[PDB]
Design a binder for this molecule. Structure first.
Ligand code: FMN
Ligand code: FMN
Ligand code: ORO
Ligand code: ORO
Ligand code: BR
Ligand code: BR
Ligand code: BR
Ligand code: BR
Ligand code: BR
Ligand code: BR
Lengths: 313, 312
């Protein structure tokens, strides 16, 4: 029996990691992720400079998930690079860093700085093209021309295998158009589906007021809200992008939901909202639960069922 | 108290079915008319009868619904006859949803509707957001295609109508959509929103998708879509001040209808909850919305419509 995953020139102990932005901003966040049972971890979407973010309250927990408009609060790219260079214990697990320039030029500058550290330590890049929460900066992945520009220039500047955090799509034509762009770039080795459902609105009936301050209450949705959307996107790209891996992100609170992500095509499985609710102890539970479901169904490895979701067509 | 006075009509309350739920057959429409609902709307129809997609094509879920019906309907002639000859307009006003799979089909259909709207007052909701027909993507996600539909239908129908919009998730798309809509004055109402398109639900017991069409991909409704619906309602409420907004998505109770109205909704549509519960839900919804209004001291809907507070 094995929850192991062998991809991207690394052996992962299990397919679980945090979703970018959850429990990965500070050194202590990252130390707690490394101490956890997670197979990996990813740093907060960083910017070239430290960034303070949107006004609070900017996160609100809901019965069916979460809404956030954090606005990319982070320590700046140099902090994450130094963590990856010196601090992170790579004998424990591999490390991803998320990078989210608000422009091509900023993302290019950060990925240039990452190059020697990836060469030195094997630090993996996830490029965020789906932040829904910075006022005036719409999700890059919803503009295919802009997406193409990012992928070209980052491919050129970084020159190493990297991944992309995609926004959810809801239109078959858009799965097709997105895949075509992505398939034009061989250094994109993984596709993370998905970021939050952008620009939802939650209102408190008692005070008749939105629950978050930024953008008149409009925020990204995660948790139970996004599971069917996340699975559709993982499978859509799994089917269209034959020479890329897909990482599943959205709605994972258990081994059984992790199992569904893997069935849909997911290599790794990212946990956001549930981890925010529960803390890093969640990873021990998730391993146990996924192992148990496999045992019940007679599966011994993840690749015995990855992408094996059954259709009736 | 719950009354709504819009579009040349008085409605007893803001509630109606969502297009496609309990509104395909004459018996469906009879039961909607007999219900406590303020209005009702016909199934999105096509010029010819449609059998729709293979089964299973609806699956009910703890947090809502997934569907890929494929516009199964009795054909435009039936809905037009229902509107001209059968429907009791003393009970409540009637909407018809039209969902031509091309502009040419939509133009043909709305032309037939003209005399019936003039004589009986039947209201058009033009469906621009079906996510369930293969090779025919949501028109509302292409602002060029959307402008052409709106132009040719404006010319062909020439009377006040509304549009069923897909949900948008990008402020840039709120801005673009509203700008396209604001170029057509005959568009008097905007229904936000249609199902969240092309989600995928898989049963872990059998490792199998739950609906047959399109490898399991269908539209999501119910509890999944409430924040998306509320956001879309309010986005268009703010961007289209000379139009009305209908709310649709995630309404299972008076509290959720209150939120839709607070976000900007004039009428409130009920899909999934109604599929679950049946037309008796409308009597519950009227009672719950009243209870919330009395607790807050509102005597009318316009005392709070669109008055959601923000902190910025
Ligand atoms: C508090 C908060 C902060 C987040 N920050 C980031 C971010 O830095 N970069 C990113 O790609 N996604 C970010 N996300 C989105 C998550 O990575 C994930 O895509 C989303 O929450 C869906 O997963 P979930 O259902 O497990 O929450 C954030 C989510 C939340 C809840
Ligand atoms: C069974 C099914 C059939 C539907 N058919 C139509 C349709 O004919 N036309 C339309 O505009 N919307 C149709 N819808 C979408 C609903 O009208 C509504 O926009 C969506 O389900 C979200 O509302 P809800 O959360 O109350 O279900 C259908 C939905 C379902 C559940
Ligand atoms: O920092 C954030 O606001 C943030 C970034 C992102 O990519 N996704 C998200 O939900 N929030
Ligand atoms: O008939 C359908 O499949 C259908 C049409 C529509 O507009 N929305 C929906 O959810 N289903
Ligand atoms: Br914007
Ligand atoms: Br579609
Ligand atoms: Br089991
Ligand atoms: Br009017
Ligand atoms: Br299509
Ligand atoms: Br959108």
């Amino acid at each position: 029996m094995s929850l192991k995953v062998n991809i991207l020139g690394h052996e992962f102990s299990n397919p679980f990691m945090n979703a970018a932005g959850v429990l990965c901003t500070t050194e202590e966040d990252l130390r707690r992720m490394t101490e956890s049972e997670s197979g990996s971890l990813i740093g907060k979407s960083c910017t070239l400079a430290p960034r303070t973010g949107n006004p609070e309250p900017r996160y609100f927990g809901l019965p069916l998930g979460s809404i956030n408009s954090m606005g990319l609060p982070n320590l700046g790219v140099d902090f994450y690079l130094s963590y990856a260079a010196q601090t992170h214990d790579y004998s424990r697990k591999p490390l991803f860093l998320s990078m989210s320039g608000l422009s091509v030029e900023e993302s290019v500058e950060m990925v240039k700085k990452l190059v020697p550290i990836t060469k030195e330590k094997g630090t993996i890049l996830e490029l965020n093209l789906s932040c829904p929460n910075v006022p005036g900066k719409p999700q890059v992945g919803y503009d295919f021309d802009t997406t193409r520009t990012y992928l070209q220039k980052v491919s050129e500047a970084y020159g190493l295998p990297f991944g992309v955090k995609m926004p959810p799509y809801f239109d078959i034509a858009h799965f097709d158009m997105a895949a075509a762009v992505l398939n034009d770039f061989p250094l994109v080795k993984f596709i993370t589906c998905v970021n939050s459902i952008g620009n939802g609105l939650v209102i408190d009936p008692a005070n008749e007021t939105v629950v978050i301050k930024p953008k008149q209450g409009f925020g990204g949705l995660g948790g139970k809200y996004v599971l069917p959307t996340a699975l559709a996107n993982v499978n859509a790209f799994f089917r269209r992008c034959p020479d890329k891996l897909v990482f599943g992100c959205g709605g994972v609170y258990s081994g059984e939901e992790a199992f569904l992500h893997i069935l849909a095509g997911a290599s790794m499985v990212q946990v956001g909202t549930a981890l925010h609710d529960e803390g890093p102890i969640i990873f021990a539970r998730l391993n146990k639960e996924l192992q148990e479901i496999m045992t019940n169904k007679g599966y011994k490895t993840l690749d015995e069922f990855r992408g094996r979701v059954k259709t009736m067509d």
